[PDB]
Amino acid sequence: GGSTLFVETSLRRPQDKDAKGDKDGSLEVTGQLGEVMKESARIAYTFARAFLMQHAPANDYLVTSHIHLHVPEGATPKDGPSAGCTIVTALLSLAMGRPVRQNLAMTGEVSLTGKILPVGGIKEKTIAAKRAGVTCIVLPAENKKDFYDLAAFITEGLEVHFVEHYREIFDIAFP
Amino acid sequence: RDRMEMINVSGYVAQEKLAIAERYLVPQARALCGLDESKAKLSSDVLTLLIKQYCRESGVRNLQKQVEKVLRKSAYKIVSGEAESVEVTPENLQDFVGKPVFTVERMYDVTPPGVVMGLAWTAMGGSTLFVETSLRRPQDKDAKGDKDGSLEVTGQLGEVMKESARIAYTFARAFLMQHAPANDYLVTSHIHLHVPEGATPKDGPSAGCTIVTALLSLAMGRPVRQNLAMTGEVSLTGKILPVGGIKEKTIAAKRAGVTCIVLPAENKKDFYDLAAFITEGLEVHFVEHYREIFDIAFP
Amino acid sequence: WLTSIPWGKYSNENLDLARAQAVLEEDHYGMEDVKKRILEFIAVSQLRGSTQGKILCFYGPPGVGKTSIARSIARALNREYFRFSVGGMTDVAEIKGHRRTYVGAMPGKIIQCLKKTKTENPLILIDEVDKIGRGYQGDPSSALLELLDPEQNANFLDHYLDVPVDLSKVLFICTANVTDTIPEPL
Amino acid sequence: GVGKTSIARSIARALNREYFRFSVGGMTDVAEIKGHRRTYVGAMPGKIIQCLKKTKTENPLI
Amino acid sequence: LIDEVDKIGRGYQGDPSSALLELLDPEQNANFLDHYLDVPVDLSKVLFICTANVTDTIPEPL
Ligand SMILES: Nc1ncnc2c1ncn2[C@@H]1O[C@H](COP(=O)(O)OP(=O)(O)O)[C@@H](O)[C@H]1O
Ligand SMILES: Nc1ncnc2c1ncn2[C@@H]1O[C@H](COP(=O)(O)OP(=O)(O)O)[C@@H](O)[C@H]1O
């Protein structure tokens, strides 16, 4: 089936090792990391750093701070990378401390520049999201058509969203 | 390996695939389903649409699955449905095969700075893999800082690929100082690049040249010219080296819509061995020293 | 063992489409994709004279009704039903038997299926295909592919009974909760 | 999906010598190609011997 | 009354867990057969009881 796994992140060591210290914010990934998962997490970390740079260069928390993230397991390896998009926003949220808009589910594949990629098993994730009660589902634009193949009665009560560049997501999660 | 000689059996282009489908696969599946030629009509336009939108890969079996599906549905609509002879038209196709999966898309039509295409001879055929580059940590470590821009390669690096990437990074630095000494972004800035996998290790270095140009783009922030591909290997001096499997990369580039293919000069003859009908509409290039590429990609 | 195997005996197959559709609709609500797929299969098989057995693999979460729908399909199509488990299986002999020179050799379990079913065109159901290990001394995936091989099935032979047996009309079905771990050749 | 085995089959037909496909990929035990010692209970010969027997010819297209 | 079900190793040359799954099967038990007496035997009315010190190590299909 599908599940609503809660990806999360938090600071795990003080950002102020030294007021002048330029050491990068090395990231630790847990949750039975797979090599592909480790690389996807690193890609998401770099993209989040770049996005925070572009948006608010004043903030450097994510730039220099050691952050621990937990991605609960259960996802098969093939779709494992699908959660990466969430990871990104998580870090960004933790970068600004702004809670993500309530009951906002999402998934996608980032490619180090924000151009989201399609993911598989869209129907299972959709039914799991409906069960969880979430109202907004953010999916890659490529998978858009696939979500429309779903029977009508399963898609009621949710404001589906389609996107290809992660920029759009940042404008929906954080108004 | 050394005990026999090897011939390169390789895939078919959209036109060749359409010919294969119409002349051999379609009648074969029709016989294997029993439907009469007049009863079921499959216009070559529908086959072209199916190949272009649904079945996109070097192989052909997927098109066989699609044609089997549509023929089975036509038989279903004939045996107990209303039409005695199903006329499969593109407008009707939507109901038979459903909405078109694998819709045509180039991954980056804009191709922002630091990203560029590359024709990689993957394990199954060839693909137009996108090499990405991006700043991953601020250039302002220190206003007086002299620390180099240590690079962090990703994408299941192979030790051979690690060495090739290091050589490409060094050559890119040398070229940047040679052209614009005032510029020092790439000289002192930690940059993360991603090279998508699927390329066989033997062809791994074939994308090294791409890496270089990508970095150069990020150095000047100039997007590479639209729909431009390239491949080859560098030897720390810009002297491009030949690469193999040119036909698969060429057909992949043709399918992807990229118009300009840049190849090592030595491979030129191997590219002319290819059939003429596969080379239409592309502005191929032949070079041996990397310098010329820098001019073509950045006019 | 040899004379107990049915030969040339083909259980009568249903051709009425409305009756089969109603039968299936009265057994499992919804799931209309599978229902329409099997309806299309029935229609195409009816149109092309004889009925062939093509392979398909249901896949989805567990408890969804994949075995129940297999039984419903077997009932509606009018052919014999039989279930078979392969998940975590390692000793190809269970599908191939033994050379018969043993002190207590047995034939593969597929010949047992043919004998019990009393028909040469039953519906064989394969369970937990993706769980095959193909580990040491085993590798039943090779013989399993042989079963699904579109042409070798027409002359499949087991180690105990080495006479080739046709398996083209048998309607195989496979069940797995995920399509990843299943071997690509299969 | 290029038809490599398909062209092999076509070549077998045109050349008129008997055809036979062989899948060695992933094979672990060499005994399949070499059989067994024939003294073990159930020992059987190599798969190539079975191919020769079934093909009924000494010059097939393996 | 089966005892210490969860202690089954299901190891080399063995795998009695498959035999158990066959026995506990609600319908296959109705025609269960052994290698010695191959005649099917009905086991629908037999009320099996399984005892285990923990529910984890026991096989999931079981
Ligand atoms: N239309 C239906 N919708 C949902 N469940 C059903 C339906 N028909 C039968 N079932 C249930 O499905 C169960 C069978 O699960 P199944 O999917 O066969 O498991 P497995 O994944 O092991 O094959 C039965 O217990 C039955 O109660
Ligand atoms: N040029 C062609 N014309 C017609 N049919 C073809 C052509 N090439 C391949 N096919 C068909 O496509 C299928 C490809 O399968 P094949 O490539 O032989 O499998 P594999 O990739 O495992 O060797 C074959 O069944 C063959 O009939």
**DSSP secondary structure string for all residues of B160-212:** HHHHHHHHHHHHHHHHHHHH-TT--TTTT--EEEE--S-B-GGGGGGGHHHHH
At A159, which helix (H) or strand (E)?
strand A159-163
Burial of B19 (0-12, 13-18, 19+ CB in 10 A): middle
SS3 A117: strand
Q: Which of C64, C72, C86, C131 to mutate to test the pocket of ligand 1 (most atoms within 8 A of CB)?
A: C64
B144 touching A (Cβ < 8 Å): no
Which amino acid is it at C99?
R
C138 touching E (Cβ < 8 Å): no
Instruction: Indicate if the alpha-carbon torsion angle B120, B125, B128, B131 is positive or negative.
Output: negative
Give the residue among B224, B203, B196 at the shortest CA–CA distance from B299: B224
Q: Do the strands B127-135 and B191-194 form a parallel or antiparallel pair, or are they unpaired?
A: antiparallel
Which amino acid is it at B93?
L
Query: Mind telling me how many Å the CA of B86 is from chain C's nearest CA?
Result: 13
SS3 A97: coil
From residue A30, alpha-carbon distances to A2, A37, B150, C67, D27 in Å are 21, 10, 26, 37, 37
Interaxial angle between packed helices B159-179 and B290-297, expressed in degrees from 0 to 180 and rounded to the nearest 10: 70
Best mutation target among C139, C146, C184 (most D Cβ atoms within 10 Å) is C139
Rounded to whole angstroms, the Cα distance separating A42 from B108 reads 22
Q: Report yes or no: B26 and B67 within 8 Å, Cβ to Cβ.
A: yes
- Dihedral pair phi/psi, residue A67, rounded to 5°: -120, 135
Read off the DSSP letter of residue B23.
I
Number of CB atoms found within 10 A of residue A58's CB: 6
- Dihedral pair phi/psi, residue C145, rounded to 5°: -60, -45
E and B in touch (3+ CB pairs within 8 angstroms):
no
Could you give the residue ranges of the DSSP H alpha helices within E1-62? Answer: 16-24
Q: Which two tokens stand for residue C15?
A: 């051709």
Rounded to whole angstroms, the Cα distance separating D35 from D27 reads 14
Nearest residue on chain D to B16, alpha-carbon basis = D2
Rounded to whole angstroms, the Cα distance separating B127 from B121 reads 6
Instruction: Give resolution, Å, one decimal.
Output: 3.7
Q: What is the B24 CA–ligand 2 centroid distance (Å)?
A: 11
Q: Report yes or no: A171 and A106 within 8 Å, Cβ to Cβ.
A: no
Nearest residue on chain A to C30, alpha-carbon basis = A151
Rounded to whole angstroms, the Cα distance separating B158 from B161 reads 5
In ligand 1, the atom with minimum distance to the C-alpha of C63 is 15
Rounded to whole angstroms, the Cα distance separating B210 from D10 reads 41
D26 is in an annotated binding site: no
- Dihedral pair phi/psi, residue E17, rounded to 5°: -60, -35
From residue B188, alpha-carbon distances to A26, B150, B177 in Å are 20, 8, 12
Rounded to whole angstroms, the Cα distance separating C175 from C73 reads 14
Distance in Å from the first CA to the final CA of chain C: 30
Nearest residue on chain D to B17, alpha-carbon basis = D2
Q: Name the method of structure determination.
A: cryo-EM
Could you give the residue ranges of the DSSP H alpha helices within chain B? Answer: 14-20, 26-33, 44-53, 61-79, 90-97, 159-179, 208-220, 246-256, 268-272, 290-297
SS3 B60: coil
Rounded to whole angstroms, the Cα distance separating B179 from B174 reads 9
Give the residue among B126, B119, B40, B122 at the shortest CA–CA distance from B78: B40
Complete DSSP assignment for C109-172: HHHHHHHHH-SSS-EEEEE-GGG----TT--HHHHHHHHH-TTGGGGB--SSS-S-B--SS---
Rounded to whole angstroms, the Cα distance separating A63 from C147 reads 57
Q: Report yes or no: C126 and C147 within 8 Å, Cβ to Cβ.
A: no
Q: Report yes or no: A163 and A169 within 8 Å, Cβ to Cβ.
A: yes
SS3 B78: helix
Residues of chain C positioned with their CB less than 8 A from the CB of D41 = 99, 101-103
User: Hunting for tokens 């990609």 — which residue is that?
Assistant: B297
Rounded to whole angstroms, the Cα distance separating C175 from C184 reads 15
D28 touching C (Cβ < 8 Å): yes
Burial of B216 (0-12, 13-18, 19+ CB in 10 A): buried
Q: Do the strands A104-106 and B228-230 form a parallel or antiparallel pair, or are they unpaired?
A: unpaired
Residue nearest to atom 17 of ligand 2 (CA): D1
Q: Which of D4, D5, D6 to mutate to test the pocket of ligand 2 (most atoms within 8 A of CB)?
A: D6
Q: Report yes or no: B78 and B96 within 8 Å, Cβ to Cβ.
A: no
Q: Report yes or no: B129 and B199 within 8 Å, Cβ to Cβ.
A: yes
A129 touching B (Cβ < 8 Å): no
Q: What is the B174 CA–ligand 2 centroid distance (Å)?
A: 48
Q: What is the C55 CA–ligand 2 centroid distance (Å)?
A: 20
Give the length of chain A: 175
Rounded to whole angstroms, the Cα distance separating B221 from B219 reads 6
Cβ-defined contact of A43 to B105 (cutoff 8 Å) = no
Among candidate residues A82, A115, A130, A144, the one labeled active-site is A82
Q: Report yes or no: B251 and B11 within 8 Å, Cβ to Cβ.
A: yes
Active-site residue, A82 included: yes
Residues of chain C positioned with their CB less than 8 A from the CB of B72 = 40-41, 43-44
Gyration radius (Cα) of chain D, Å? 14
3-state class percentages of chain E: helix first, strand second, coil last, to nearest 5 = 25, 10, 65
Cβ-defined contact of A124 to C61 (cutoff 8 Å) = yes
Rounded to whole angstroms, the Cα distance separating A151 from A129 reads 15
At A148, which helix (H) or strand (E)?
helix A144-148
Which amino acid is it at C160?
Y
Give the residue among A65, A63, A58, A49 at the shortest CA–CA distance from A17: A65
Interaxial angle between packed helices B61-79 and B90-97, expressed in degrees from 0 to 180 and rounded to the nearest 10: 90
